């Protein structure tokens, strides 16, 4: 073993001169021998410790027109790339720019050596990422995504993922070279799990970029990623889900989504907390202002599945904020919204939803829960149970808190949205006579009248609306007059908002 190293060390200087010789017959033979040397452990340690030999190998690979000489030098460099010290020699000898040129080779063996060596450098060699980028390696790797060897594609896509992570420039290059369509096509075509996994990781990295994200959606990546949501490989499923969640907010104009939504609803019952989390967040965005998707989600038992997720989640706002938001969406503005409002009750959802209004809930989850209750209150069968769970005193208490703040962004949420939301929910709960006795008995009429002076139009409308509902009973109509409500309601008659003026007239009539 030690005598092998001595023999190699002495041969190398002479082998170096022959390898960088004019005569290509000399060079071919020298390169074949250098490759044979690089297979044995002792003599390859000698090769990587000679900077001039490694340079000769790199120069010859760049320059040769002989196929056997391309294969041997590339194989030599590939053997050196399994060791830290060999990686450093390749880097220091301008071997990254050379290997990037070889990614354009028509010789498949050279291509396969070049990508695997480059993969080794990208994993283990400080500086290798900037060098590959600098050499224009990304444009070339993207062009290679139309090859059909699945193993070569798995390594190519992993090189793309390493290079794109945390680098805006590499994401845009990938996009400018047709990266999205090629990646999405791979997901639509192959079944090799290693390749699906690496490709899904590139798409995950591109899905946070705001130029790439729309491009992935247009190519059908939403539907392509959905195809693998029940694969036995968990790392594949989780990557597809993380990616779908990033893309979800730009996919609301998309169609042929029936299969994806169906599977997301089934995934809400996973015992994996990251799966449930992504399924909830994706569903919340895909139901947002999309009546077609809402109908499909309700039809496959989405309400039950979402209520069960809120019950399991507890004080986990990462899960409840999106789940509640999806329920909010499914309970308004489509054919089956009445059925959905009833369904939240029938599947044990009312007690748990009212509880989410209470601490330690934060303002994003409170804003959305208030909104869900507002929708649920459109269905008369929820009026009574919602009263029983304590929704009214708590909505009123949040309204006082948010209004007092607006005189004397908290947690991401504007306090005016909480005033509009809570009063809006009280506006609709006040359709029940029993609710009117609770609301009024909490000394709310003074504050509702003071809200008529609010500059924001949406708050005027909602405050006038709840005042309008309360006035239908006589004793309440007198307390509204006594609070000096006549003046501000008269000035609200001449409003550009049609609803504000309507409710304002209706209050004035019922005070006589």
């Amino acid at each position: 073993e030690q005598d092998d190293a001595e023999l190699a060390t002495r041969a190398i200087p002479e082998l170096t001169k022959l390898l960088n010789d004019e005569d290509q017959v000399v060079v071919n033979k020298a390169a074949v021998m250098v490759h044979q040397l690089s297979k044995k452990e002792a003599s390859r340690h000698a090769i990587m410790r000679s900077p001039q030999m490694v340079s000769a190998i790199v120069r010859t690979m760049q320059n040769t027109n002989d196929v056997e000489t391309a294969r041997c030098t590339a194989g030599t460099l590939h053997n050196l790339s399994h060791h830290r010290e060999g990686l450093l020699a390749i880097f220091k000898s301008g071997g990254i720019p050379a290997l990037v040129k070889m990614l354009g080779s028509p010789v498949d063996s050279v291509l396969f050596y070049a990508i695997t060596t480059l993969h080794n450098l990208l994993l283990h060699q400080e500086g290798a990422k900037m060098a590959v980028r600098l050499a224009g390696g990304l444009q070339k790797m993207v062009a290679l995504l139309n090859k059909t060897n699945v193993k070569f594609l798995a390594i190519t896509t992993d090189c793309l993922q390493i290079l794109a992570y945390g680098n805006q420039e590499s994401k845009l290059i990938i996009l400018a070279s047709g990266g999205p369509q090629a990646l999405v096509n791979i997901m639509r075509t192959y079944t090799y799990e290693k390749l699906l996994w690496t490709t899904s990781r590139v798409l995950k990295v591109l899905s946070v970029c705001s130029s790439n994200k729309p491009a992935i959606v247009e190519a059908g990546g939403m539907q392509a990623l959905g195809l693998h949501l029940t694969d036995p490989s968990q790392r594949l499923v989780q990557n597809c889900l993380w990616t779908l969640r990033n893309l979800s907010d730009a996919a609301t104009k998309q169609e042929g989504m029936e299969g994806l939504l169906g599977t997301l609803v089934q995934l809400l019952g996973s015992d994996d907390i990251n799966v449930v989390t992504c399924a909830a967040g994706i569903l919340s965005n895909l139901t947002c202002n999309n009546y077609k998707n809402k109908m499909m989600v309700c039809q496959v038992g989405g309400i039950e599945a979402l209520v069960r997720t809120v019950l399991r989640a507890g004080d986990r706002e990462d899960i409840t904020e999106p789940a509640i938001c999806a329920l909010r969406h499914l309970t308004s503005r489509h054919q089956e919204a009445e059925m959905a409002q009833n369904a939240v009750r029938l599947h044990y959802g009312l007690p748990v939803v009212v509880k989410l209004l209470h601490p330690p809930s934060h303002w994003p989850l409170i804003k959305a829960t208030v909104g869900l209750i507002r929708n649920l209150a459109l269905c008369p069968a929820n009026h009574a149970p919602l009263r029983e769970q304590g929704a009214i005193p708590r909505l009123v208490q949040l309204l006082v808190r948010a209004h007092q703040d607006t005189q004397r962004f908290v947690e991401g949420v504007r306090m005016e949205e909480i005033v509009e939301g809570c009063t809006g929910a009280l506006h609709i709960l006040a359709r029940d006579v029993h609710n009117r006795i609770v609301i009024r008995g909490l000394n709310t009429i003074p504050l509702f009248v003071q809200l008529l002076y609010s500059p924001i139009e949406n708050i005027q409308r909602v405050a006038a609306g709840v005042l309008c509902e309360l006035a239908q009973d006589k004793e309440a109509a007198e307390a509204i007059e006594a609070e000096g409500a006549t003046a501000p309601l008269t000035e609200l008659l001449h409003s550009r908002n049609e609803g504000v003026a309507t409710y304002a007239a209706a209050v004035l009539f019922r005070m006589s």
Binding site: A8, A11, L18, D21, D23, V25, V26, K29, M33
Partner: peptide, 23 residues
């Protein structure tokens, strides 16, 4: 050419000599 032909025969002979030492 003639001069370059001698360069080849010697250079290829150097290679076979090295290949005996190593293999």
């Amino acid at each position: 050419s003639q001069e370059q032909l001698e360069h080849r025969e010697r250079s290829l002979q150097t290679l076979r000599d090295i290949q005996r030492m190593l293999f």
